[PDB]
Amino acid sequence: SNTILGDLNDDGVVNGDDIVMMRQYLAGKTVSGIDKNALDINGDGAVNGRDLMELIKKVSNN
């Protein structure tokens, strides 16, 4: 029931805390409290640096 694009921690907002999770996840770290369902931001089937790129864009455009 997380309907906010890029809200990896499912706290209602999209900010640098979600960027931290994406970065830590891309490095292969275990991210506690992460919503794995929110990682594929551009809906292309994979979770990679282009989802981080999109996430950094969304924050700057807020």
Binding site: A27, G28, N48, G49, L52, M53, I56, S60
Partner: protein, 147 residues
């Protein structure tokens, strides 16, 4: 992308004896549009080599204090390198040079001969500061084990 250039990500070559630690570079060339994003995977023979370090060239990869250069080795025999400009403007890659350095440990019981370092061409991504595709091209490297 307006230039319609093809950026090439190349992996270098190195020779070493069994048990040696060897350094091989990863280079980017034919850069024209400022690059804000790079995703690339490098495949290696896990039975022969163990990843020791994957470090950026800070004279080219800036803002590494804010995690612009991410490394993932969670998959056997694969190194995933992600470069992103955290500012989307201030720290792009705009010249040809070395992107990173790969340090491998050669298994002491490794056999002599070449072992390719392959850049996955289907996962290679290169984009500008607004995440727009830049045409990419992969060039493989290798490690020559001497005996």
């Amino acid at each position: 992308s307006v230039k319609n250039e093809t950026v090439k990500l190349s992996v270098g070559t190195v020779s070493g004896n069994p048990g040696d630690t060897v350094k091989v570079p990863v280079t980017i060339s034919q850069v024209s549009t400022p690059v804000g994003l790079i995703c690339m995977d490098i495949s290696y023979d896990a039975s022969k080599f163990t990843v020791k370090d994957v470090l950026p060239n800070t004279d080219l990869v800036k803002d590494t204090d804010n995690y612009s250069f991410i490394v993932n080795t969670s998959t056997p025999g694969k190194i995933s390198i992600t470069f992103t400009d955290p500012t989307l403007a201030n720290y792009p890659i705009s010249v040809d040079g070395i992107l990173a350095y790969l340090d491998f440990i050669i298994n002491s019981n490794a056999t002599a001969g070449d072992s390719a370092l392959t850049v996955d061409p289907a996962t290679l991504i290169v984009a500008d500061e607004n995440d727009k595709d830049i045409k990419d091209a992969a060039s493989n490297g290798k490690i020559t084990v001497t005996g």
